[PDB]
Amino acid sequence: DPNQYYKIRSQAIHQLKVNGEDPYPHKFHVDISLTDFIQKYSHLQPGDHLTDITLKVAGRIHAKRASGGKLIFYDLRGEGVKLQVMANSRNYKSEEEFIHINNKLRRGDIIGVQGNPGKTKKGELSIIPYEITLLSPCLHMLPHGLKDKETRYRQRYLDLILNDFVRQKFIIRSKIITYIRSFLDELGFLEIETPMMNIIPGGAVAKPFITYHNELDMNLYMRIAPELYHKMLVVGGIDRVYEIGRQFRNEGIDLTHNPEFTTCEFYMAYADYHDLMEITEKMVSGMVKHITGSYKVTYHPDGPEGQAYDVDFTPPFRRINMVEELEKALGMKLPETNLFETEETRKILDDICVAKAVECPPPRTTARLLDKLVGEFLEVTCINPTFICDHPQIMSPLAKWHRSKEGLTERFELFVMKKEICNAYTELNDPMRQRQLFEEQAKAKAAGDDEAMFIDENFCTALEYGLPPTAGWGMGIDRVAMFLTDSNNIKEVLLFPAMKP
Amino acid sequence: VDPNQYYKIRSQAIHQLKVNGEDPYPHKFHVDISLTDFIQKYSHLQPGDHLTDITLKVAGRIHAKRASGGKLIFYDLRGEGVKLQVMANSRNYKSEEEFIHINNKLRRGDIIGVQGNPGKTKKGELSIIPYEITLLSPCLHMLPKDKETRYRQRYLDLILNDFVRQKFIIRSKIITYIRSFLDELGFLEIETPMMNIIPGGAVAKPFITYHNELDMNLYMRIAPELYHKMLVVGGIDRVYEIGRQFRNEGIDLTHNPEFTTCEFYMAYADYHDLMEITEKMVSGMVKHITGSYKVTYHPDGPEGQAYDVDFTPPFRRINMVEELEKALGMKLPETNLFETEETRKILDDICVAKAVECPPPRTTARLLDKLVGEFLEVTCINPTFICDHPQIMSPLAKWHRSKEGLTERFELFVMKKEICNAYTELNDPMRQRQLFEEQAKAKAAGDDEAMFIDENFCTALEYGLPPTAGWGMGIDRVAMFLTDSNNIKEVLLFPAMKP
Amino acid sequence: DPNQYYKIRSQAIHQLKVNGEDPYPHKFHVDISLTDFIQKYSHLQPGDHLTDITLKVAGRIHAKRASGGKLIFYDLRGEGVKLQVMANSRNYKSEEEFIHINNKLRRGDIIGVQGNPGKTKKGELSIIPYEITLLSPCLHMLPKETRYRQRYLDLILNDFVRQKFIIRSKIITYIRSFLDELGFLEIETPMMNIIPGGAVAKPFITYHNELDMNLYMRIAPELYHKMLVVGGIDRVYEIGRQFRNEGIDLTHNPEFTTCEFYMAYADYHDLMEITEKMVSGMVKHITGSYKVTYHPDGPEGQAYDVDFTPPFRRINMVEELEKALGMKLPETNLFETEETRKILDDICVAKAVECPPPRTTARLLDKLVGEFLEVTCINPTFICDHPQIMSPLAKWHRSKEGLTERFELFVMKKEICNAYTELNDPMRQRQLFEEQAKAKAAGDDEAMFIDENFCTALEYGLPPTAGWGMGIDRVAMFLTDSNNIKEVLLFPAMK
Amino acid sequence: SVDPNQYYKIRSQAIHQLKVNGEDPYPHKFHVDISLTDFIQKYSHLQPGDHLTDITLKVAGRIHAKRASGGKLIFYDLRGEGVKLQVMANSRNYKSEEEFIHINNKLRRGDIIGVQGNPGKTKKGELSIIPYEITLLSPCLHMLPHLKDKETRYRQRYLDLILNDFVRQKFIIRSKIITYIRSFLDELGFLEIETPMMNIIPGGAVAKPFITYHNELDMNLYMRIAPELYHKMLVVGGIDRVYEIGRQFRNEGIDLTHNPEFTTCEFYMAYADYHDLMEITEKMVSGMVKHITGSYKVTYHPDGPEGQAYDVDFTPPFRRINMVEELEKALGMKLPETNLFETEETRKILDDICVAKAVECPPPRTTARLLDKLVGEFLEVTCINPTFICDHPQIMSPLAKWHRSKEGLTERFELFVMKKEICNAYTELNDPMRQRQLFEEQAKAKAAGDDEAMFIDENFCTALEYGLPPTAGWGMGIDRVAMFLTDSNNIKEVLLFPAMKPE
Ligand SMILES: Nc1ncnc2c1ncn2[C@@H]1O[C@H](COP(=O)(O)OP(=O)(O)OP(=O)(O)O)[C@@H](O)[C@H]1O
Ligand SMILES: N[C@@H](CCCC[NH3+])C(=O)O
Ligand SMILES: [Ca+2]
Ligand SMILES: [Ca+2]
Ligand SMILES: [Ca+2]
Ligand SMILES: [Ca+2]
Ligand SMILES: [Ca+2]
Ligand SMILES: [Ca+2]
Ligand SMILES: [Ca+2]
Ligand SMILES: [Ca+2]
Ligand SMILES: [Ca+2]
């Protein structure tokens, strides 16, 4: 019984303490890691037992198997690897200390082991200990944080101990971010840090978190995006900047959303969105190949017991135009794109949503109705990497008008395995038009839209100093790690995901 | 010229270009070569040269416009911290009529594209001779100094002050160095929550916010420390995170409410081991970035006192209580008595006698810290480890091996400022609880910075955290001392400003 | 004296082996190069002595200078760099060992130094020895043809020499990366041939005993490269040695290095452009500029800057020859007649242009171009459209009868490149071989042998292709301002 | 069916007719827009039945096959760059119907052609170009084999490369080996250098040289056996790290693993010893196999395709055996003390052992040669995985430094892989007096009989008198490495134009 186990084991190590036995020693000198030990001694023959090499290793006891009173086997784990400790009475510093030490040890315990390399008749690489030291006891009975999702996510440390697939997803997450940095560093992007607390949040349509600063007596918002700060640096004459950082959205959690999440944004002066499409294909495909070995990954939309898809990251990625493809999916013609800002188009998209059973919680604005329709008809068909391009201006308040198609913008979004990955556009750099677009956002806000943008006059002022033609880009790191690890739940790729209380 | 007037006039001029179909903000200008690479490629031309056979496109911002007789205009084109002269005469331009038209259009501050031939003036100034200039983005204001202005419009600061970009390149090299140093040592770069039901890991006043879908309060993190230790329990022996933290407190020359730290945790290490990796990282960082192990610093501004600071290892070490007794000329209580009300009174009397301020609450930890700040930390010009902090100041640090009442802790001080905080980690779950219970008592007796009880973290400790040592470093603070900046606002792109 | 020194030093060294003090120890562990030591401690100040740290360095002693009896300065050199050893008795292992090592050491000796970084009051970066170990004694007294016969002395004493060879090797690395990026395959073809071919030159002959068979050293890789193009490898290159049995002079060595490359579907116009891109990019990248200063008459002569900015000047051989002569030559379609040989012979006599026998059209013509055209070529200059009578492997010119699609690059008066659209018609190639063989039979030692399995390969279909070959040694000469090729060969052929 | 000699006669006469009629069967210039490789990459996404009227491109290649399908439809199998593209020649898409039959009537398998036309894909999903115009660039006057015969493959490599794509891939592997080594050495600061291939005195190895004569200088010259001595003279010059990848020449017999000119990489590293070099060799060889191959494991067919297949594991560290101890173990008997390996007695002992063990050794039956035959028989043959054979006797190693603890031995190793010697390395002998005595012992042997023994090199000994720093050097056969990385048992497989016994 777990609770009784805890009471018993807690009382025992408490006894060790008051009697001065030091169950939490300060320092154990490790000579070699378990990984290096296995690399250096795997070549031994079964039955071997080295007399001229003694080493100190450490790890956690995963299993304790008695073989008579004279012989115990410890399954010792660390670094994603394992090493057997063959504790034989005859090789220990003394037979009485052998009994004493092994009677204390339990599964879960962190230990230090001083011993000789060996291999059993079976051929299991082992260390035969002269001395075993308890470094940290485990006061709890470990799961025979095992399969129950909830326990795994609330106690990630148990998950990481018991399930090596979990450690592997977090390694690849680190490689994603590291790959992106060298990719951008090599292209001359300067890595920067902009404020995560804003008097006025910006850079996206989203509901922010609000705080208060006592000394300065002001309310602050947690950032939605670093976008506006980045463009001000480009006005400043830093032509290539990027930031990999946390963004915060005051919204609900589900399979693809956490209230804090990581993105990479970058801004490149003298680029347009066509250039970013090629950079994107290059970065994403190079990234998949680098870490997984090929351009093809397997996709299980329905878990391990469902259909398996091979997703091909070989460039170039498919491109669809948002308004055209939607009309095709609808089998019906939408208004001319120059009419996408009229109330009548709004009514038309509203009627279409009712008729097609596409829900849209209030406000039923053109932007939100459009996005719901695109989510239903286009996004779900994006298995392979696909750019959805040319977003209407009404859904894109900071993108530059498209140069040949009235009412549209130079904007794309990358979709992979039904999930949005990147959002990019050539940047709106006309201050008068940016201001008019902010004002529309402000009136939507005043009319009951929690997510609408605040007018940022200080940013419009910066645009009045001259933002060179620029293209910028934003990628959700968590989303990429999801698809590179074939995870359908974002909680798989965050170490400590946000959780219902 | 009234700037308001200039703005109003240029705004009109540019509105007119839009209504004339002369789009002043074009979509795409194809730059063939950066200014930096243009300079390095043609840097060996001779005075008077004009390579009519090669044609390139460059771009940048106009920093000066200077006419010279209606058929010859020079634009000082800048970019990437560098300059190139545009020498435009009408003979070489696409058209004489187009030549007049573009010059009448352009102004100082405008971003432009230049298509033209490499060349050099008889004076020996590298130049490009334009066939065509394109307005890419007009500057609607007249361009200009004083700190306020530079910090509130960092883009102006960056355009006019070249030293500014340089400080920020130093900062990004600091960070790239640390990642590279740690990655080589097999540390895994990770990300832990910046929003917590319970903030912990430091002594600090947190920001609080509200998540309405879950109907619950959340604190912005003050440190990632407890999360990192839970990852060590889970068998990731070495982790680090370079990330923002948040503190609801006053701004000053060394404090911003949000700031960047590197924290790392390595199993099987103790604080002595960390003293060694710290010397190698900081010393090697200083040398790699500034070419030398020596940095001169100006606490009193330019034309002030100028200490030369020596980052050669080993760093000097001092014991907190031992040295405080010396700096003071008196014997303090024995370290095993630091929990008593008698000690607090002794410490309080001292602070009154030496005129050391200590806002309420006047607790032992707070009185000590004030005393150490004025007696020890001021003397730390060269990198100096202050070690062996009392336990009442270090609720998450492991007890000292031999000195009762002390802990295995150090702080790294450079130029009178705290850079690092590190210790052998407390891994005994029952001892950690006791120490949280005292933090919660301190919080209820007036201390806004005192820690909350984190039972979930205490539970993690009950599974078995191996002996471990952890470390935290203020990146902004490193940036300050590697750029000779006395104000943290110099090393933050957009520092927090009073409204 | 030198002979005495040798004899005395040899006995001293011999005495050390017999005293169990091995003057040639097996292994000295070097902690840090001299170059890195200098980069690491450039920030020290006068009087500094980092007793904290102890490094091991190594080098050749260039000077031994004792002040008193408890202090000595060794000028340690290595890697084109130098470091002062400040040996003093108080810091050395012991006073007894300090005298012993100093009595033992001499100028020239290779030594290992274990010590602390430091600086003298005078400001010189130093290492202060705990211990100095003799690594390899120099048994001789240290000090153009002396430099060339003992290139190891030259390299010890003249810092400029290693810099030229570093440039030489940078030239070659650059050419491999240029061609590798263009998709060329780096290959290796035989240097020993039954029939030598691919150039007009006199070959070396040797004998393979096992096979009882005469073999020639290659004069060019060209025919094998073309056989690779027939085989479907569209782009091949080889940077290797060629051998010619001929006299030495300022620009000629009996063995030398060429880069040759062949590209299918190219002609000599495409290769002119690649030549400009490669040579100009090479000059700019190595030196730092497209301009190189050239001293034709040594350092105490006139200096003319040479401009490697593309495009290079082009001259047509026959058109410019006619102008530099101030006279009309035979029509280019009459170049195989006996009349025109006599015309050309007469012109060489009238202009005092030497031409040793055989006085054939191809040789009379080459002499004339050498003296009238090639001397004007200081800036990189292409000489184009060579007559067919001097170009047996080149494809005929498609507009000018008698000429071929050929060029040679000239830089600072000397031939650097030879390139052309390749002849790929096997019957025409055979014809031209047959005429080479008649030239051979009539006095010309450089004339080609008939290579019938090359003509057989051409019968399978060589695609239209263009080939190119550059003398690497001559590129090194003009990039190091050397007028003597012995300057850019480590071990040049010496009489 | 037509006979090869007749086919050649007929095709030659036809091509000659084109020439005299002014028809241009060998045009100067065809502009190629795109390579077959880029065409395939750019257009493979097309769907079956597709035909772009939107893109016109010019490609080129050699006809591998010509198959009619009616009279108005011809399929050409076009090959280049190790790759393949179908030319769907359709009468109705060609520039005209009369020009269509005219061009196809003259084209044959083997011909080099240029093709202008549109991308397309057949119903079967076969990527094609649909020509508007096909141009003969170069006719093939011979029938191509309708191949496997080694001798034809090696005497006419251009055919082997045309017909057998496994052959291109071997030579690609070989270029990657060489390119890998340069980057490895350059990155460690080695200076790539070139030293004389013609020597007044050859040296640097025991081998029989080629001899030639320089007329102008009236001098006999030898082709180089090894660059070794020139390299060590550069290390005395203060160039601490030098390497050279170049041709060596040996006047000896040809067989499965020997060509009379072959390629080695030699490098010298000042302040290194042969232990340092074992570690670098492991690093280099194991990284090279993984880089080129994808893993540390390679398959080895000692007996050809239809024989046993061994996995050879290049995972470091490599096995080490000491030459003399392992030899005694294989013999099951004790040899003389290593300090006795220079005596006549020891020679007689080795001679008797060779007779008794059926180990042949042609004259001269010297100790070095008898030991080497015994090591070949009993040790080298067992080296399948990369194996260092170590600490050769001084009598076999005239240029290697004596061993620091084992009298009679040297600090030398050789790397064997799949039964073949790959590398030869040692701590260099830098004592000029000992070097000179070792040369005189070689010269004594030369005058006694063996034409492989070394010449005394007094210029080199003089260089050693100026001080050669302690150094280790290293020599590797590129051809040998290329053999084992492509699983070839015959060196002819990895030389473009191997030496061959006369016609
Ligand atoms: N003996 C030599 N030494 C060095 N380089 C040579 C030698 N012979 C020829 N070359 C170089 O090799 C290149 C191609 O060989 P080619 O047969 O055209 O030489 P070449 O015309 O005989 O040279 P030159 O006229 O200088 O004697 C030449 O352009 C030249 O750069
Ligand atoms: N979390 C600490 C830094 C690391 C302390 C050592 N575990 C702080 O904020 O001060
Ligand atoms: Ca979306
Ligand atoms: Ca989006
Ligand atoms: Ca502090
Ligand atoms: Ca602190
Ligand atoms: Ca010549
Ligand atoms: Ca010539
Ligand atoms: Ca020539
Ligand atoms: Ca051998
Ligand atoms: Ca050998």
Curated annotation (Swiss-Prot), chain C:
Presence of keyword Membrane: yes
Residues that hold substrate according to the record: G198, E222, E260, Y262, N418, E422
EC number(s) reported in the record: 2.7.7.-, 6.1.1.6
GO molecular function, one term: lysine-tRNA ligase activity
Sequence positions bearing N6-acetyllysine: K17, K70
Mutagenesis or variant effect for V30 to D/R/W: Disrupts interaction with AIMP2 and the multisynthase complex
GO biological process: basophil activation involved in immune response; diadenosine tetraphosphate biosynthetic process; ERK1 and ERK2 cascade; lysyl-tRNA aminoacylation; positive regulation of DNA-templated transcription; positive regulation of inflammatory response to antigenic stimulus; positive regulation of macrophage activation; response to X-ray
Record's keyword terms, sorted: Acetylation, Aminoacyl-tRNA synthetase, ATP-binding, Cell membrane, Charcot-Marie-Tooth disease, Cytoplasm, Deafness, Disease variant, Host-virus interaction, Intellectual disability, Ligase, Membrane, Mitochondrion, Neurodegeneration, Neuropathy, Non-syndromic deafness, Nucleotide-binding, Nucleus, Phosphoprotein, Protein biosynthesis, Secreted, Transferase
Record's comment on post-translational modification: Phosphorylated on a serine residue after mast cell stimulation with immunoglobulin E (IgE).
GO cellular component terms attached to this protein's record: aminoacyl-tRNA synthetase multienzyme complex; cytoplasm; cytosol; extracellular space; mitochondrial matrix; mitochondrion; nucleoplasm; nucleus
Result when mutating G118D: In LEPID; does not rescue the developmental defects caused by KARS1 depletion in xenopus
Activity modulation comment: Up-regulated by DARS and EEF1A1, but not by AIMP2.
Domain of life: Eukaryota
Catalytic activity: tRNA(Lys) + L-lysine + ATP = L-lysyl-tRNA(Lys) + AMP + diphosphate
Modified residues (Phosphoserine): S136
Positions contributing to ATP binding: R244, N245, E246, H252, N253, E415, I416, G471, I472, D473, R474
Outcome, altering S136R: Strongly decreased tRNA ligase activity
Keyword Chaperone tagged: no
Family stated for the protein in its record: Belongs to the class-II aminoacyl-tRNA synthetase family.
Domain-related comment: The N-terminal domain (1-65) of the cytoplasmic isoform is a functional tRNA-binding domain, is required for nuclear localization, is involved in the interaction with DARS, but has a repulsive role in the binding to EEF1A1. A central domain (208-259) is involved in homodimerization and is required for interaction with HIV-1 GAG and incorporation into virions. The C-terminal domain (452-597) is not required for interaction with AIMP2.
Free-text function comment from the UniProt entry: Catalyzes the specific attachment of an amino acid to its cognate tRNA in a 2 step reaction: the amino acid (AA) is first activated by ATP to form AA-AMP and then transferred to the acceptor end of the tRNA. When secreted, acts as a signaling molecule that induces immune response through the activation of monocyte/macrophages. Catalyzes the synthesis of the signaling molecule diadenosine tetraphosphate (Ap4A), and thereby mediates disruption of the complex between HINT1 and MITF and the concomitant activation of MITF transcriptional activity. (Microbial infection) Interacts with HIV-1 virus GAG protein, facilitating the selective packaging of tRNA(3)(Lys), the primer for reverse transcription initiation.
Record's miscellaneous remark: Shares a bidirectional promoter with TERF2IP/RAP1.
UniProt disease link: Charcot-Marie-Tooth disease, recessive intermediate B: A form of Charcot-Marie-Tooth disease, a disorder of the peripheral nervous system, characterized by progressive weakness and atrophy, initially of the peroneal muscles and later of the distal muscles of the arms. Recessive intermediate forms of Charcot-Marie-Tooth disease are characterized by clinical and pathologic features intermediate between demyelinating and axonal peripheral neuropathies, and motor median nerve conduction velocities ranging from 25 to 45 m/sec. Deafness, autosomal recessive, 89: A form of non-syndromic deafness characterized by bilateral, prelingual, moderate to severe hearing loss affecting all frequencies.
Oligomeric and partner information: Homodimer and tetradimer. Part of the multisynthetase complex (MSC), a multisubunit complex that groups tRNA ligases for Arg (RARS), Asp (DARS), Gln (QARS), Ile (IARS), Leu (LARS), Lys (KARS), Met (MARS) the bifunctional ligase for Glu and Pro (EPRS) and the auxiliary subunits AIMP1/p43, AIMP2/p38 and EEF1E1/p18. Interacts with AIMP2 (via N-terminus) and MITF. Interacts with TARSL2.
Protein name: Lysine--tRNA ligase
Organism of this sequence: Homo sapiens (Human)
Lineage of the organism: Eukaryota, Metazoa, Chordata, Craniata, Vertebrata
Shown residues within the full chain: 72 to 574 of 597
